[PDB]
Design a protein around this ligand. Structure first.
Ligand SMILES: Nc1ncnc2c1ncn2[C@@H]1O[C@H](COP(=O)(O)OP(=O)(O)OP(=O)(O)O)[C@@H](O)[C@H]1O
Ligand SMILES: [Ca+2]
Ligand SMILES: [Mg+2]
Lengths: 123, 364
């Protein structure tokens, strides 16, 4: 698959975050990176530049404690799809609220924040 | 805007519905009935209820279709009677058992396009859909339904075929076993309506003991473990250690005179067939799915048994969602609803161009 946001994914070093919104992958405004709705699921792509010029990828799907099944399932599938699109070069990481990996946490300079709420389930 | 359909073809029960719904709209027996000695045929609940004048057939065995004529009837009925749709108007996602023969995948594809004129279709592995429904891309799924129990290791979205294993024992076997052991108590359940009573007893009173021997000692010592069951008339029966001896067969197949390993060992064995580098992720993500995994106490027991087989430093985690009976179907509903699904399905054009073999290049 080649979704519009997939075309934007992993083009240069940096962080990209999308939120699952009713079965679609929606970009999160850069000014809000780090602010996660506990009732939502997100997909985070960390692109790191390698010495030979190619890019290293780590895909993290973050699951809020109250996100609905369609959101967590969609986040997982979009992650497999994004990896496939990126020629299988991404290491996938499941990140559950309150149990995130040091690596994921380390992507947020000031530390990530949790906020109650989110977009309604797509079911 | 188009509406996709999701059909999970179980050996025992078919689950059908619309992508986007959180549950299948129709769940019915995967049975085709025909006039016994001489409507030409019936499907599902109606076939089952008219068994007195019909000869019944189950076209799916161990998740694999064994009769395509009967399968077409189930699908025809599913579309027109259960879902009330015109199939030529909807993309259709179908599920398949792990290791489904290549010939069978092509057949299913040909039937959809040629017989039903579906505008598009896709085939997904049941176990994988269940893993997705649990919000994971890596884990090992223990899928136990009607006739077979599968252990399917999946890494970053894809099953590892070489490590898929199976126990030829599942729900119908447990129902038949409960039938047998209840006779030792002095109860005769032999007819179809009687077998249905036994299934209900299995589904309502059975449970998996954390420690079987100790559970047996408890039952023998007192009546603490006894439960009462009221038959359709009013007769009340008493069931004891049969409550846990029945599902114990999943862990001790010798109970059914089978030589194969129980489900905990099959799971451990599948894990050991995978690269050491990913085994940690499998042990930490054991997902249970299917009707036969619905017994109370099964997750606690799987945790205990797997913990005994794995190094003490291995973190064991059993995931048993309450909705695991429809996990496969739910996973399909989500997949079929994604904005990116429209590109993964096989379209009519593609079928016309490449034929049934296109399924191996679009669905893997
Ligand atoms: N609460 C329950 N406790 C124990 N068994 C249950 C329960 N609910 C359903 N079952 C059993 O699960 C089985 C049906 O499961 P399921 O619907 O997952 O199988 P299927 O889709 O038809 O099979 P398969 O995947 O083998 O093709 C039957 O044997 C049924 O009695
Ligand atoms: Ca939400
Ligand atoms: Mg099934």
């Amino acid at each position: 698959v080649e979704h519009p946001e997939f075309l934007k994914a992993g083009k240069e070093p940096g962080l990209q975050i999308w939120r699952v919104e009713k079965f679609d992958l929606v970009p999160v405004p850069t000014n809000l990176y780090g602010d996660f709705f506990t009732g939502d699921a997100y997909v985070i792509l960390k692109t790191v530049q390698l010495r030979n010029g190619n890019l290293q990828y780590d895909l993290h799907y973050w699951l809020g404690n109250e996100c609905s099944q369609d959101e967590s399932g969609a986040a997982a599938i979009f992650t497999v799809q994004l990896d496939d699109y990126l020629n299988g070069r991404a290491v996938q990481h499941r990140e559950v609220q309150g149990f995130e990996s040091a690596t994921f946490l380390g992507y947020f300079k000031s530390g990530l924040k949790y906020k109650k709420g989110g977009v309604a389930s797509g079911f | 805007d188009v509406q996709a359909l999701v059909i999970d073809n179980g050996s025992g029960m078919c689950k059908a519905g619309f992508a986007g719904d959180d549950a299948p709209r129709a769940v019915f027996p995967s049975i085709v009935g025909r006039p016994r000695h001489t409507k030409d045929s019936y499907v599902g609940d109606e076939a089952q209820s008219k068994r007195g004048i019909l000869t019944l057939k189950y076209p799916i065995e161990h998740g694999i279709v064994t009769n395509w004529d009967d399968m077409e009837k189930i699908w025809h009925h599913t579309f027109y009677n259960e879902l009330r749709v015109a199939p030529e108007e909807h993309p259709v996602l179908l599920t398949e058992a792990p290791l489904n023969p290549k010939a069978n995948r092509e057949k299913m594809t040909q039937i959809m396009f040629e017989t039903f004129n579906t505008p598009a279709m896709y085939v997904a592995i049941q176990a994988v859909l269940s893993l997705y429904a649990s919000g994971r891309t890596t884990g090992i799924v223990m899928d136990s339904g009607d006739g077979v129990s599968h252990t399917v290791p999946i890494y970053e979205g894809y099953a590892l075929p070489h490590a898929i294993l199976r126990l030829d024992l599942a729900g119908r076997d447990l129902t038949d076993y409960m039938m047998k052991i209840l006779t030792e108590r002095g109860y005769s359940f032999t007819t179809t309506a009687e077998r249905e009573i036994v299934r209900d007893i299995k589904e309502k009173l059975a449970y998996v003991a954390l420690d079987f021997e100790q559970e047996m000692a408890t039952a023998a010592s007192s009546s603490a473990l006894e439960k009462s069951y009221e038959l359709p008339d009013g007769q009340v029966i008493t069931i004891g250690n049969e409550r846990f001896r029945c599902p114990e067969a999943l862990f001790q197949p010798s109970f059914l005179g089978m030589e194969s390993a129980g489900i905990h060992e099959t799971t451990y064995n599948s894990i050991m067939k995978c690269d050491v580098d990913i085994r940690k992720d499998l042990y930490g993500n054991v997902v249970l799915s299917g009707g036969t995994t619905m017994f109370p106490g099964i997750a606690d027991r799987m945790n205990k048994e797997l913990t005994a087989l794995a190094p003490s430093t291995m973190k064991i985690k059993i995931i048993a969602p309450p909705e695991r009976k429809y996990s496969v179907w739910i996973g399909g509903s989500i997949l079929a609803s994604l904005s990116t699904f429209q590109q993964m399905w096989i379209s009519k054009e593609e079928y016309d161009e490449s034929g049934p073999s296109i399924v191996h290049r679009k669905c893997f």
